[PDB]
Scaffold this active site. Structure first.
Site, PDB file in Angstrom:
ATOM      1  N   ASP A   1      13.474 -26.328  60.272  1.00 31.35           N
ATOM      2  CA  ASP A   1      14.079 -24.929  60.934  1.00 31.35           C
ATOM      3  C   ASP A   1      13.383 -23.814  60.390  1.00 31.35           C
ATOM      4  O   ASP A   1      13.096 -23.299  59.076  1.00 31.35           O
ATOM      5  CB  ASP A   1      15.415 -24.985  60.155  1.00 31.35           C
TER       6      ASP A   1
ATOM      7  N   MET B   1      16.608 -33.030  69.183  1.00 30.23           N
ATOM      8  CA  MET B   1      17.518 -33.004  68.052  1.00 30.23           C
ATOM      9  C   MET B   1      19.066 -32.797  68.429  1.00 30.23           C
ATOM     10  O   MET B   1      19.155 -31.590  69.157  1.00 30.23           O
ATOM     11  CB  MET B   1      16.909 -32.179  66.939  1.00 30.23           C
TER      12      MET B   1
ATOM     13  N   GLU C   1      19.792 -31.282  56.042  1.00 28.56           N
ATOM     14  CA  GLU C   1      19.494 -30.063  56.038  1.00 28.56           C
ATOM     15  C   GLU C   1      19.886 -29.478  54.504  1.00 28.56           C
ATOM     16  O   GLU C   1      21.247 -29.138  54.566  1.00 28.56           O
ATOM     17  CB  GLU C   1      19.718 -29.108  57.472  1.00 28.56           C
TER      18      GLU C   1
ATOM     19  N   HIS D   1      24.985 -28.336  68.331  1.00 25.54           N
ATOM     20  CA  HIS D   1      26.212 -28.781  67.659  1.00 25.54           C
ATOM     21  C   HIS D   1      27.021 -29.447  69.015  1.00 25.54           C
ATOM     22  O   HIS D   1      27.087 -28.774  69.812  1.00 25.54           O
ATOM     23  CB  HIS D   1      26.904 -27.990  66.763  1.00 25.54           C
TER      24      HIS D   1
ATOM     25  N   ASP E   1      18.929 -15.466  58.547  1.00 30.36           N
ATOM     26  CA  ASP E   1      18.534 -16.165  59.681  1.00 30.36           C
ATOM     27  C   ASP E   1      17.872 -15.179  60.669  1.00 30.36           C
ATOM     28  O   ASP E   1      17.772 -14.981  61.951  1.00 30.36           O
ATOM     29  CB  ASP E   1      19.715 -16.632  60.570  1.00 30.36           C
TER      30      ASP E   1
ATOM     31  N   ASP F   1      22.543 -15.941  53.846  1.00 28.15           N
ATOM     32  CA  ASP F   1      21.432 -16.510  54.891  1.00 28.15           C
ATOM     33  C   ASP F   1      21.283 -15.468  56.184  1.00 28.15           C
ATOM     34  O   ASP F   1      22.321 -15.477  56.739  1.00 28.15           O
ATOM     35  CB  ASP F   1      22.119 -17.682  55.283  1.00 28.15           C
TER      36      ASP F   1
ATOM     37  N   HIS G   1      16.899 -20.937  53.900  1.00 28.78           N
ATOM     38  CA  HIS G   1      17.542 -21.843  52.681  1.00 28.78           C
ATOM     39  C   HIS G   1      16.940 -21.807  51.494  1.00 28.78           C
ATOM     40  O   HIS G   1      17.668 -21.602  50.355  1.00 28.78           O
ATOM     41  CB  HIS G   1      18.420 -22.843  53.211  1.00 28.78           C
TER      42      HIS G   1
ATOM     43  N   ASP H   1      16.092 -22.047  63.795  1.00 26.39           N
ATOM     44  CA  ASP H   1      17.357 -21.851  63.522  1.00 26.39           C
ATOM     45  C   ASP H   1      17.669 -20.333  62.999  1.00 26.39           C
ATOM     46  O   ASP H   1      17.322 -20.119  61.863  1.00 26.39           O
ATOM     47  CB  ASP H   1      17.807 -22.605  62.568  1.00 26.39           C
TER      48      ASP H   1
ATOM     49  N   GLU I   1      15.259 -25.734  55.645  1.00 25.57           N
ATOM     50  CA  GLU I   1      15.071 -24.260  56.579  1.00 25.57           C
ATOM     51  C   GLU I   1      14.464 -23.219  55.717  1.00 25.57           C
ATOM     52  O   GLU I   1      14.715 -23.181  54.526  1.00 25.57           O
ATOM     53  CB  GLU I   1      16.532 -23.799  56.725  1.00 25.57           C
TER      54      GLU I   1
ATOM     55  N   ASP J   1      29.115 -26.798  70.310  1.00 27.85           N
ATOM     56  CA  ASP J   1      28.357 -25.712  71.138  1.00 27.85           C
ATOM     57  C   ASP J   1      28.030 -26.170  72.673  1.00 27.85           C
ATOM     58  O   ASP J   1      28.250 -25.331  73.611  1.00 27.85           O
ATOM     59  CB  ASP J   1      26.879 -25.542  70.503  1.00 27.85           C
TER      60      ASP J   1
ATOM     61  N   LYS K   1      21.083 -26.489  51.667  1.00 25.77           N
ATOM     62  CA  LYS K   1      21.320 -25.058  51.621  1.00 25.77           C
ATOM     63  C   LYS K   1      22.007 -25.110  50.216  1.00 25.77           C
ATOM     64  O   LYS K   1      22.788 -25.880  49.721  1.00 25.77           O
ATOM     65  CB  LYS K   1      22.362 -24.571  52.610  1.00 25.77           C
TER      66      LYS K   1
HETATM   67 MN    MN Z   1      19.131 -24.418  60.082  1.00 18.08          MN
HETATM   68 MN    MN Z   2      20.117 -20.283  58.101  1.00 16.18          MN
END
Ligand code: MN
Ligand code: MN
Ligand code: CL
Ligand code: CL
Ligand code: CL
Ligand code: CL
Ligand code: MN
Ligand code: MN
Ligand code: MN
Ligand code: MN
Ligand code: MN
Ligand code: MN
Lengths: 386, 386, 386, 386
Positions: free
Chosen positions: C244, C87, C180, C53, C256, C254, C219, C286, C216, C56, C182
């Site tokens: 992802d 990406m 993406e 990002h 992860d 979520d 998600h 991710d 993802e 980031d 969600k």
């Molecule tokens: Mn993701």
């Molecule tokens: Mn996630």
């Protein structure tokens, strides 16, 4: 390899391999099975035993002489194969009369009939040598709020189970009861929806020692719950009287897939726990070969149940026996978890400045738990990639 | 109308209206609130009282003189407003030291510290006059199977609650404990995930009479469970010591919407049940004004909690008082549900041919339950469309 | 073995291994990572690249000279390691200004700013050589019905993506967009909640060829959906621009988890499908090392992502290459599934009495699909128990 | 009041009020209904019309003369009552032959038969004057990963719908198709599981203009999705050809409760949206009176569907017409949401320093959205507590 023996104590309900494939949107895809044939096929596969609902063994409405003949034939197949009948149960859900419940039906006459139906089959279960009598109150519940006062209903549920306990006591029977929770389906919400609710309910019965739980993999998962955690609490309580093994893919209708299908890692942790705890009851499969299958598929699916248990048993045992895993468990402080927090007693805890005044919380916090390394060791063991 | 009075016993956690709006994907959207300001604003809205985590009232790490000053100021706002503090709790989830739990942390030193932290705030809760001490073990659980032996963990949970019970007893305090279940979040699975599990666990404690549950609307719903059913079982057990009111839209993260939002009909049946059962404890809101809101939105959301309860109370009472509803309840046999199945005893049941031999199951089956007509009466009452 | 190489094209977001462990109930458990350090550690583990990002890589509010320095240092670590940046994406969710969305914020000025923020980072992504630009509209949605007119919002979403497509076109950039989905979290419901919704939306954009999906694992699973099925539809549409990879245990927040954790069998079928379809994009993780972990745990968890992919790749390939599996696939008629239903055309179908008038439906029905035998072969292959 | 008129265009499937109450755990609780009787009773209740599966109207296997007689009788009831038949559909799920699907059955001969069965009933639907032809591919999907290559299956699904589109075109029929998504049940996962997936799929058909969606309240909710959001996207796409109205309590089996039951607030926002958007198609109920009910309960439940729509229509309209609500909508900037983000074009956006260089993000962030005040106005309107 991974060949089951009757010593593995694998059992199956007559209604599992005998499920004809009727679902809410479709007709039967397989013919009915003669219980005698199921006993024989299951025995050939390495099963230890079978279980039944009254109405699986004896058709609803059977006359006493039809009853005896059904029983006689079944008894001959058991004698022929060495198969056992460790558990039995009552069908209090199929007949329309049970559309609002058995023990907690709003209609009093239906509740009475549900008890009589039950009592009748307990005598037969005892005769066939069953040690456990399961109750799955699939119709106990509601689709709407006003239809069921749950406090009144629990009063009626307690009344029913207390009467059953009085009965088995009065007959000197050694059989015990196992309540099987399900959160929903076929009722919109079902009473005692989880292992927790069942366990709590039992503590309100007159002779709680006579009742345990019969948790089902898929049912707890239908509530998004962790089935190995629930089994652990059941074991902790001393109430794991029986278990139903199968697979489920998430929060949806009750799928009753073969054991090992569904949530594969939960199956591994479950087997790990059962073997580690020394669970000595039947390894019972309450499952349904998918209606896509013919009879060869039915027996393949039943074999797969047993296979998958045995494979998971081998991997869990290798995990626990691995010195590198034992070191990881120590690094993650599982040894500390098993030690009492304060065997020194309350006052010594209050007096211990190392527990508060002089506790370095930041140093404690900084200590990683090393749980991912431990879990990848478990993964590698599960997949045979060590 | 639907104006709350302190006599409605509506209470709020300092952390609810004081939530700054930090979520796992975003920064705070509101400044921190002085507890003194919250007490005042809540009092103006008609609240009866407030609740707190130790760390909400007194910042983590506060020195004893900072501690006294925080407490003194809070006590002045209570005196200024007539507000009460009926419940308090411990924060055993925010500090990194609790990343694997408080009472069931794998690290023994952390478990000891968690007990000391707790004991300290119980003394303060008693001083502020709290009757209930809540425990929400949000960090008790796991993301992976090997990280937490649940039987060992429950052993440690029992040890902790028994020590707390020994403590309050030794101090002659009248406060009782209420365990607040949550099935997951922030841990992948949390121990005692539902009302059921909590209720069952309590029956294994040394003095079970000291412990009840503090169920939260949203938490049970996170397991897809029927919150009015769970409350009924809690009431049936005599264990509804406290309750957390809010809204939740299904099985997802803990949303903590204002009460009445989320599942509106479940809110109606809940209020119906609480009022019908004579629940006399606080009507406590554990909620979060959405982070979209400014402080005017915070107070609007808090007002809405109270409003919605009072509206639902009026509609439920009118439902139950409606003669047409009373007749429907009889047509659906709710009166029969409340009658014992077999007060005549086991032998008379066994001897009653009307219960089996001569039971007309087809006539019984043919009797409709008339539950839809009853439920549309409830709907019409809820929506004020009678 | 199962050692990754950069040729495996394994990539990681800076925000994954760099996640400090803040969750909605707790503070950070790990210090912030310098992106330079992550690049280096990831390279050592066998990673091919990293993603970011804007916020980031470059702290929010950075001055242009701070910006250049951050970029210069990162560029040196890439040069030092041979790591790529395939990406990049924009953070339109953390800053409070985005509390009601970026592209679909009710406030027009916020939508404009969200586009400018995005455009700025696309230029940087292109400079670092990114081929894909992801958009995760985590704040696009609502907690209540009146707050968001979804038709107006989709109008604004289309406007935003069309402008981005105009921009990249006007700059002659070859980068493509990947949306993406969600379904919820942090908003109560999020717009374009699944792969399906995203795919459909894209067909309404001005230049649909510029947009695909970045699904993802976790998600879709948060909606109880089958992630391999969704990926298949994405592939079928020609829209799998990125993916992802991670793990998720059911319908909840979520999680992860590392790839391979969560739903292990879905991970197997996913790898099977990606390899079988020749997916040639990055294998991007991710994920979030659980906050229980220290930095050694972070790198262990990241390694596990890669390991598990490679193990699952080996098992899927052995499954498909197994002659006994190839015969089962034929017995289950997977070969027929791949044949056109009616290449002979509509009229010949209408004229074919074998398709209706003289179709023996009962014989067809009687043919078992043999799917359980096929699935146990897949299970045996997955667990290395052949 | 809240009396429906045929002008409200309320329609019901023959299979809804005619559902005999068979579920996966129980036998029928009601006798079969003659379609002629349903037409008559529904007409008396204020219904506008009925819908049917081929096999609801004409029993499977009927001879051509039995066929004509069934049709003749039905046609007389329509003539007798003024009732319409705006939609019809095919049963491709009940017969065992469809156990692996209709259009995407692995067996090619079954796919051909499924098309012929469909085509036959389209001619009849046209004769009875239907404008919409629904397809619910309940058997299209899988319980296991290897059983169904989803890319091949989607190829077959496209082939089938393209052939149907060729057929209706070749016959000059004006009827359009509406695909009805469902995420699971009876298959473990069903293809095109949500509105999104269906919408995306349609864009790959040869004549996309001939196909829309027939979303069902309960089905999207079975995926935990927001049904008003999905309907909005369908409307946005111009693809809301039909709709199925009912109630569902969360993520579980398909409950098919009466409309207004289940998620009451979602029902309100749905009606708000349909009326606001000018949806002009049938208000179709795909529901099941609970099997607890007798025939009086069946008609009560059907009446309740209509009642609840009309009550919710009144409350939504009063909400939108309320000047205090209109002011709240402005305070929440719903007016801004409806304005283009950048009608001034891309370059002017890039050149606008108010959009980035000189955007005060902190002032923007500080502006509360006032969504809770707006939502409590909606709540007050819904409950008639203004
Ligand atoms: Mn993701
Ligand atoms: Mn996630
Ligand atoms: Cl209880
Ligand atoms: Cl327990
Ligand atoms: Cl769309
Ligand atoms: Cl598609
Ligand atoms: Mn089951
Ligand atoms: Mn079972
Ligand atoms: Mn909560
Ligand atoms: Mn709470
Ligand atoms: Mn349905
Ligand atoms: Mn439908």
């Amino acid at each position: 390899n991974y060949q089951p023996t009757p010593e593995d104590r694998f059992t199956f309900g007559l209604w599992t391999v005998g499920w004809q494939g009727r679902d809410p949107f479709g007709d039967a895809t397989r013919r009915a099975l003669d219980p005698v044939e199921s006993v024989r096929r299951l025995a050939e596969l390495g099963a230890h035993g079978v279980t039944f609902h009254d109405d699986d063994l004896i058709p609803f409405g059977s006359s006493d002489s039809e009853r005896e003949e059904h029983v006689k034939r079944f008894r001959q197949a058991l004698d022929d194969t060495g198969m056992k009948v460790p558990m039995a149960t009552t069908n209090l859900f199929t007949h329309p009369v049970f559309k609002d419940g058995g023990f907690t039906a709003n209609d009093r006459d239906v509740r009475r009939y549900a008890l009589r139906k039950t009592i009748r089959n307990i005598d037969l279960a005892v005769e066939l040598g069953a040690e456990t009598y399961v109750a799955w109150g699939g119709r106990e519940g509601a689709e709407s709020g006003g239809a069921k006062d749950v406090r009144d209903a629990l009063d009626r549920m307690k009344e029913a189970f207390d009467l059953l306990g009085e009965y088995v006591t009065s007959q000197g029977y050694d059989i015990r009861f196992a309540i099987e929770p399900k959160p929903n389906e076929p009722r919109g919400d079902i009473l005692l929806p989880t292992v927790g609710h069942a366990l709590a309910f039992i503590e309100r019965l007159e002779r709680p020692e006579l009742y345990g739980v019969n948790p089902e993999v898929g049912h707890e998962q239908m509530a998004g719950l962790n089935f190995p955690h629930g089994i652990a609490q059941a074991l902790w309580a001393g109430k794991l009287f029986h278990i139903d093994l199968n697979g489920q893919n998430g929060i949806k209708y009750d799928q009753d897939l073969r054991f090992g299908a569904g949530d594969l890692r939960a199956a591994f942790w479950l087997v790990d726990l059962l073997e580690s705890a020394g669970y000595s009851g039947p390894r019972h499969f309450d499952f349904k070969p998918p209606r896509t299958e013919d009879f060869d598929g039915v027996w393949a699916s039943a074999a797969g149940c047993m296979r998958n248990y045995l494979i998971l048993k081998e991997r869990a045992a290798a995990f626990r026996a691995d010195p590198e895993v034992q070191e990881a468990l120590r690094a993650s402080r599982l040894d500390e978890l098993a030690r009492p927090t304060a065997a020194d007693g309350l006052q010594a805890l209050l007096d211990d400045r190392s527990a508060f005044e002089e506790f370095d919380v930041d140093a404690a916090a900084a200590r990683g738990m090393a749980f991912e390394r431990l879990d990848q060791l478990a993964m590698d063991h599960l997949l045979g990639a060590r």
